[PDB]
Design a protein around this nucleic acid. Structure first.
Lengths: 38, 99, 93, 200, 121, 64
RNA sequence: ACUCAACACGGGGAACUUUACCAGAUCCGGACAGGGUGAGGAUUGACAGAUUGAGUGUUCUUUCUCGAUCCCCUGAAUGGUGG
């Protein structure tokens, strides 16, 4: 497909649960409310 | 018919301030209150590669959300429901329903 | 192009301006309610031309552009229209 | 719902990023938002609330207007407020900004960091840390540590207490990194994992 | 009105029309436009020597009953309109010599003055 | 030293399409051939090419 | 990328897209006119004809549609999956 927070279209696009945050990796680009505890 | 209130939120201790506290106002005060126990809590689980390159040990993560759906039931308020749903303002993603 | 005419109006009585960066057209505005139809690329070009003259101030987040019109920018804009004004930002409030 | 929570995440992200870039060196802590039913308060945490507002009032309505024009919001469904955060010391991001300013002014790393440390540890903080990696030489990528009081990285509980900030400074020869932590003296879980007390 | 206030009140609406979008400029642009009568006044430079220019534009203006006024020169006309590019010595950098300027708009005291003429019709 | 496509064209009109129909005794008529049913009015005129005519702006099939 | 901390790894199950690379064409993004061309300009858009894989309107001829932004010379520039 294509991405909306980059225009790269490569370095892999997440479209799981209707979000993109893997053309800007979510570890760097957090505050989506996710956490790791386990 | 009978009006129900589902409150859906990411976080506990937002919904708590809604159900327990602000249902006291509707408890026998203007309508009758039938408490069940709230609906099953979904997880949204996502799996993200830590490494930004092909050299690591090919590591991954487990990220999880809680989805709290807090259901309590009433017996047919009409026009009174305006009060009920104006009570919480205390957090974002507090949404309420009327049948 | 006659396209650029519409965007010369779009600066005025809309305050801060906003655009998305795309190589393919799409209407930049929403708030103004003017409902000009222009490709985004053209809009961007004009925003940039008069950014280079120090008239406009640029700010940017993610992929989106938001262009604020400075005191200087306002002054220029009023003359280019002819139409004097009480300064675009401060009229709205 | 599933989608609600995600989209709320998106909104917060975009908002937070816009401000944290383009409005800076005001002692910006962050933002917080909540609904009041068909209106969203969106308070803006700053040490200096005057720049947030503007003395011509242009700033606050610019920032409202940018949000409106993006998301199709209108007045009376959207609002922006200011909030006075006392003690810039207890805000990671705020200290981070002031430190960044010192470094871009081309002042000494040591002297700069010592300012932050003095400020923080005066207000009664448990500890702080300033880890400035990057150039200071050439030819290294040298890392300098400054560590003060005490700080925990144990458990997952630490993350709640300790707020953190990472920022960049951009100088000749290239990037300089900056990081600030600061363990608060006041818990945000109201919990400690050490010292059993005896009430006498 | 005074003879001053004729050429002057002519000049002001020209100046205004230029700096807003109230003016039409250009040969084939004006002619075609007078036919649908966007213009509500015209000004016609007699110094333009072009064949059947000075003739026919009066006719076309009468045919649609758009007011027309005639002036001495296209140079004079151009710099009444206001156009003049300023070098540091105050000597003009470039001069357009403008013909074919038909004006849609009018101010109030020009409209008043225009009914003191009533030319062409 | 070849740049292939793109060059200066210098083309189109001079003072041609000078005015509408000349007048002041009777009307004498245009330079070219008429356009029936334009949508931009009859100030547009049609090509002479292959016994076909064509409107370069309203894009009609009409012939002579 | 190359003992381990290479080698169903670069969320990399890629055919046109993605694309670095190859076979060809195009754009202005070269913005910014401060030194020049307004009308009729190097132009915007255009049927046919031609151009060429591409009746595609880039181009060239024809003729039409033209804002004068596009266009001319320098400086300046921005963009990049280039090291």
């Amino acid at each position: 497909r294509h991405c909306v927070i980059c225009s790269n279209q490569k370095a892999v696009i997440r479209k799981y649960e209707l979000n993109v945050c893997r053309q800007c990796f979510r570890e760097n680009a957090a505050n989506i409310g996710f956490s790791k505890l386990r | 018919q009978r009006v129900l209130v589902k409150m859906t939120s990411r976080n506990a201790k937002a919904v708590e301030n809604v159900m327990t506290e602000l249902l006291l106002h509707a408890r026998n005060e203007k309508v009758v209150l039938r408490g069940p126990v709230r609906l099953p809590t979904r997880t949204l689980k996502v799996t993200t590669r830590k490494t930004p390159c092909g050299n690591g040990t090919n590591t991954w993560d487990t990220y999880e959300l809680k989805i709290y759906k807090r259901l309590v039931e009433l017996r047919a308020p009409t026009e009174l429901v305006k009060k009920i749903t104006s009570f919480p303002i205390d957090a974002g993603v507090d949404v309420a329903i009327t049948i | 192009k006659r396209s650029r005419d519409d965007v010369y109006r779009f600066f005025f009585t809309e305050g801060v301006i906003s655009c998305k960066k795309d190589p393919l057209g799409t209407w930049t505005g929403s708030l103004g309610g003017k409902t000009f139809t222009v490709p985004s690329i053209q809009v961007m070009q004009l925003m940039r031309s008069m950014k280079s003259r120090g008239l406009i101030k640029e700010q940017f987040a993610w992929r989106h552009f938001y262009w604020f019109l400075n005191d200087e920018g306002v002054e220029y804009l009023r003359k280019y229209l002819f139409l004097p004004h009480d300064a675009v930002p401060n009229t709205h409030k | 719902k599933k989608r609600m929570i995600i989209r709320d995440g998106v909104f917060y992200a975009e908002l937070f990023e816009f401000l944290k870039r383009e409005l800076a060196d005001d002692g910006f802590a962050g933002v917080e938002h909540r609904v009041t039913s068909t209106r969203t308060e969106i308070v803006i945490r700053a040490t200096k609330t005057r720049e947030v507002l503007g003395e011509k009032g242009r700033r606050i309505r610019e920032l409202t207007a940018c949000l409106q024009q993006r998301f199709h919001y209108k007045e009376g469904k959207l609002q922006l407020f200011a909030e006075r955060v006392e003690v810039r010391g207890l805000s990671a991001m705020a200290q981070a900004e002031s430190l960044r300013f010192k470094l871009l002014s081309n002042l000494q790393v040591r002297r700069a960091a010592m300012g932050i440390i003095r400020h923080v540890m005066e207000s009664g903080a448990k500890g702080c840390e300033v880890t400035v990696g990057g150039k200071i030489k050439g030819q290294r990528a040298k890392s300098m540590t400054f560590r003060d009081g005490y700080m925990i990285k144990s458990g997952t509980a630490h993350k709640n207490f300790v707020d953190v900030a990472t920022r960049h400074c951009h100088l000749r020869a290239g990037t300089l990194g900056v990081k600030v932590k600061i363990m608060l003296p006041k818990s945000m879980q109201n919990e400690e994992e050490i010292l059993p007390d005896v009430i006498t | 009105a005074t003879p001053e206030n004729l050429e002057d009140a002519l000049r002001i609406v020209l100046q205004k029309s230029r700096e807003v979008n109230g003016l039409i400029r250009g040969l084939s642009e004006v002619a075609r436009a007078l036919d649908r009568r966007t213009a509500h006044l015209c000004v016609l430079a007699e110094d333009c020597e072009d064949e059947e220019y000075k003739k026919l534009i009066t006719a076309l203006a009468k045919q649609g009953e758009v007011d027309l006024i005639n002036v001495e020169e296209r140079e004079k006309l151009a710099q009444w309109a206001g156009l003049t590019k300023m070098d540091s010595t105050g000597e003009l950098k470039k001069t357009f010599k403008c013909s074919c300027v038909a004006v849609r708009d009018f101010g109030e005291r020009t409209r008043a003055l225009e009914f003191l003429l009533s030319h062409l019709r | 030293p070849i740049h292939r496509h793109k060059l200066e064209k210098m083309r189109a009109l001079k003072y041609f399409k000078v005015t509408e129909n000349d007048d002041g005794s009777f009307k004498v008529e245009r330079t070219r051939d008429e356009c029936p049913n334009p949508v931009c009015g009859a100030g547009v005129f049609m090509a002479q090419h292959k016994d076909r005519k064509y409107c370069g702006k309203c894009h009609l099939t009409y012939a002579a």
